[PDB]
Design a protein around this ligand. Structure first.
Ligand SMILES: Nc1ncnc2c1ncn2[C@@H]1O[C@H](COP(=O)(O)O)[C@@H](O)[C@H]1O
Ligand SMILES: Nc1ncnc2c1ncn2[C@@H]1O[C@H](COP(=O)(O)O)[C@@H](O)[C@H]1O
Ligand SMILES: Nc1ncnc2c1ncn2[C@@H]1O[C@H](COP(=O)(O)O)[C@@H](O)[C@H]1O
Ligand SMILES: Nc1ncnc2c1ncn2[C@@H]1O[C@H](COP(=O)(O)O)[C@@H](O)[C@H]1O
Ligand SMILES: O=C1NS(=O)(=O)c2ccccc21
Ligand SMILES: *C(=O)NCc1ccccc1
Ligand SMILES: [Mg+2]
Ligand SMILES: [Mg+2]
Lengths: 326, 320, 322, 327
């Protein structure tokens, strides 16, 4: 039987005996993602270039895509009546939802990662959903939960086609956007990552600054000590694209710490934790080098975290090299 | 003033005082590219998954779209594709003067991960009075009349290079129209990104090894280059065009003549690069100067910003 | 606040404190309608005409039927499905059965989709009332028993009109994102209109009451302004115009269609329910459409519907000739 | 072989041994039509209703869509470098193209009929007629005052259940269906011809009190055939493109005739009656005012009205028989 994201989410909510609040949140997020996808694929770009003359360009049309994407996710989540605290890459402080529209969920999101997009590189939206735990008035503190508290997480990849990957307790499920009908179609159910892959993914241009454990691990991939075939290298430079390839083909993805960047580069709350949760729910791993990403207790909603994630055998091999150097 | 691919191509054809044949070729290719884009973005995938209660692989469909649209243009006589072992000879009633070599959906082995994919094309005019044959496609890239690619990335863009320069068109899917968004584009003199599969490090020639070491540990103490390698040639080359820098697919052990195909991968990208003021070399000569003997022959390629390719060549010359 | 059909339907179901089954039905129907719209607008027609190499209205009607049927069966919310396209009622397989009975016209192309003007989808949703094994009899409920009804118009744009106890709401399909956007809330029809809609080619076969009523629209006895006439010949188009601008739509029995021409279960009853929920009226002449007790799933009915003042005026003419 | 409007127009221009100017005009018009269709189908309406936190449902969306459609046709035609004078239903005066962008052609068009048609959700359309400038005078409204017999090309786009473009030239009438998945008009009906006699009549019978006696009698004969043949069916959308296209596809007759209160009819000669009359005649149909062929009227005002009765030739000739009976 065909399944859509809308029907799938509704049915999981029925099975969970929920009140429909999380379902409304996810519905609203799915709608935002479809609107982001349409914009990313440059629908209406002819108006920006004067097809109707100079007087027919709107206000949305002229915003940069990462601004529009933030506006779309913020507005759709607020209007779901399911959220109380919203954390976005865009805004320094957590957004506290107006009291009339408050639900119990806290959403951390990256509205359009990779947009730094002029080369038409894949870009994506990343999200993580928590339940508020405090009895207090909602505040930024409610977003400072470890990733192991996540209720749902995932990403939309605007690549050759648009796909939403959604991870919950039931596992990881992949939905392809059919732009003819604006429906996400379930195409890969309960997906699991390979135990070990053959691809490694990191920016090797910064080799001069590598931690010695990273240097050694990468040397093992290119010159395997057991004379096995060297790993192939892929690095899109857009995390959603690199992580999704890691999920589908297996292997390892690294944005590790070093001496100049002791806490890595990627953002814990809305980049590392959602991807770590997807990976763990698919039978993979995600580590900072010293602990699981999902076990870090944040103190700052924009704090950075190192991340090495992917196939468990590959992450484990990295950790062995890391422990040798520690 | 707004401009479309259709209007732009038509006007350049009028300026050229042509007969309209190459214009019909380019219109037909534009239509094929829009149809490939639609399929790549998975329009209609709901029907494959049973929405109505119960299709070709994308690279096969893409080949069929380019082949059929080019044949029905009445502008072509020899068609070379990655998909077909032998050149396709157009039937007499539909024959025009142009030879087209193309890659209908480059990067599709990894399509499963939704990596950017693309279509690559190069167009030659047939020289002979002879009956068309596979040998008519054995021309050096210097003889190209037009070349370019369509990148199906975050958005779909067609890059078209001709004598008049390089022009970039964005597909607006709301109206199915390619809109001219970057005119007479030129690549940066020197970039800050290098692009190659470093998994082959063990098999690299010493010149490639040394060049990459220069990017990571610059001898003038400039900042190291960043690395990007999508693993789909159209994506990596387009990034090279837009941001500058260098792209390499040199020879290794599984590929001792390089991996990429001269006629429908290397030559079109080399032509785009040279028309944008960039460079494209095999190491020993310009890609566009290689005289092919096999329509599927491979070639090494190092291309991109001229100062970066020249820096590679300086290292290459030290080792040869 | 922007509102979508998906969000709207979900919230009404939360307020209803239902189990989510009717919500799943409506979500599945909304998806089917978006798929019909895409096909009606001829997405992919280039492939039918050979764009990739060598290697129809009825077929679009069949495809639309297949889309509604499959989306409804796979909803697990339905047990009996009556379609204009199928001679017999479809009984949902035991493992996929839910509580609801749906009568629908998936598309009205066979007729004039060759002129391209307008086609539409009409639906009416009932709860199964009997505890017997599911059969065509479960679709033989009076329209008064409807839980939800409505239509999609595939016109200059695609609009879905959904009527329930909460009233009538209109949603516009934004094809850029595949979302039905709420654009007209709790719609009510004008108490009196200035347009009449019927096929006057049947003039020779009209009964005297219809003849007199139409004469009053062209030659008002109070010498007020004559009504304008419009007639597309597609029920969704003609009824939607009646809802939006007011007036009256007639498809009466004539001498050659003595029981009427339109079909009660999936044309007259859904449109009668939309009209009544919007403050309008829908009569056969003898009784409210929604009060007719059907005996046969494809039976026909006369229908006169629209603004209440106009339908009441027709009914006074009708009683005069009674 | 598959054929697209782009390929078809280009090849007809090659056969004509033209300079490519009319081809560029037609390419530009096809692009405008695709853009109108996208807006008509309400792509992006979610943004108008606040999906990104900004609403703007102000004024009349129907009027704004007519104006946007005018802006699309105007700008695409101006930038074609193929036109010199542009007459639009939406503009009081003829638009004179700036000198640097002037080509040879004069275009009369109705860009959209949303505001004039109560059935705007049912169907809207674009109508166009293309002339060659006939004098070397500085361009002016007078360049658009040519009889329809002078048309080089004419046609319409119907934004109905699907979007179709109908293009008439000397080679005949050809019908193209827009495939929105790829933005391509696919040739689906070649060299089309109207039936000699139809079975449908189309007019607003709400005007019956004001009808000319000949119109009253003719319609009476369609409903009560003197020979007891089957009565005609009636259809009237109230959008000219929809009603005329049905007449082309199924045959029959469409009437917007003159009467004592409207002695020149209601529809406009330059961008409604003449393009439709040209499509009809190229399809083997007829188009009369009652007194002469629509295409032979020499206009004196760019917005002047003309009566029109068009469609299958046996039906139009029968109307003229009844019209003559009352003259
Ligand atoms: N659509 C859904 N999919 C999966 N789990 C859900 C869904 N809806 C609710 N739940 C679970 O039930 C809890 C309560 O739901 P709610 O009452 O909607 O906040 C959530 O926090 C989830 O653990
Ligand atoms: N649309 C066009 N754009 C650029 N150059 C063209 C075009 N059409 C023709 N030419 C040039 O004119 C030559 C002859 O054109 P043709 O007669 O169409 O084969 C081509 O090989 C090109 O060198
Ligand atoms: N989405 C909805 N919108 C309006 N009413 C609903 C909805 N869902 C359920 N209801 C009402 O609640 C009843 C029971 O719903 P269910 O348990 O889903 O069959 C329905 O028959 C309706 O009367
Ligand atoms: N694409 C075309 N289709 C049909 N006829 C054309 C076309 N292009 C040019 N013609 C004919 O040739 C004449 C001169 O064309 P042009 O030089 O483009 O103004 C036109 O006025 C038409 O009669
Ligand atoms: O695809 C089509 N659907 S349609 O019946 O309106 C039609 C009419 C004519 C040519 C093609 C087509
Ligand atoms: C305008 O585009 N739509 C309003 C309308 C028109 C006809 C019937 C119903 C609604
Ligand atoms: Mg039907
Ligand atoms: Mg108008």
């Amino acid at each position: 039987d065909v399944n859509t994201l809308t029907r799938f989410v509704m049915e999981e909510g029925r099975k969970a005996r929920g009140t429909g609040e999380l379902t409304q949140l996810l519905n609203s997020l799915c709608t935002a993602v479809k609107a982001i996808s349409s914009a990313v694929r440059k629908a209406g770009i002819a108006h920006l270039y004067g097809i109707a003359g100079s007087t027919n360009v709107t206000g949305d049309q002229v915003k940069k895509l990462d601004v529009l994407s933030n506006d779309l996710v913020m507005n759709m989540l607020k209007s779901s009546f399911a959220t109380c605290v919203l954390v976005s890459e865009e805004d320094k402080h957590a957004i506290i939802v107006e009291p009339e529209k408050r639900g119990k969920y806290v959403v951390c999101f990256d509205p359009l990662d990779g947009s730094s997009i002029d080369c038409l590189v894949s870009v994506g939206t990343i999200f993580g959903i928590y339940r508020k735990k405090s009895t207090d008035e909602p505040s930024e503190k409610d977003a400072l939960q470890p990733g192991r508290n996540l209720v749902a997480a995932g990403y939309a990849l605007y690549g050759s086609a648009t796909m939403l990957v959604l991870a919950m307790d039931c596992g990881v499920n992949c939905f392809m956007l059919d732009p003819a009908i604006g429906e996400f179609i379930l195409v890969d159910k309960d997906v699991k990552i390979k135990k070990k892959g053959k691809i490694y993914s990191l920016n090797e241009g910064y080799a001069k600054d590598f931690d010695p454990a990273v240097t050694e691990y990468i040397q093992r991939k290119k010159f395997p000590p057991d004379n096995s075939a060297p790993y192939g290298a892929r690095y899109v430079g857009s995390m959603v694209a690199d992580v999704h390839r890691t999920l589908v083909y297996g292997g390892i993805f690294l944005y590790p710490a070093n001496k100049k960047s002791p806490n890595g580069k990627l953002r814990l709350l809305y980049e590392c934790n959602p991807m770590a949760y997807v990976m763990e729910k698919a039978g993979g791993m995600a580590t900072t080098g010293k602990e699981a990403v999902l076990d870090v207790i944040p103190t700052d909603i924009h704090q950075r975290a190192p991340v090495i994630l992917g196939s468990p055998d590959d992450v484990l091999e990295f950790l062995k090299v890391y422990e040798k150097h520690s």
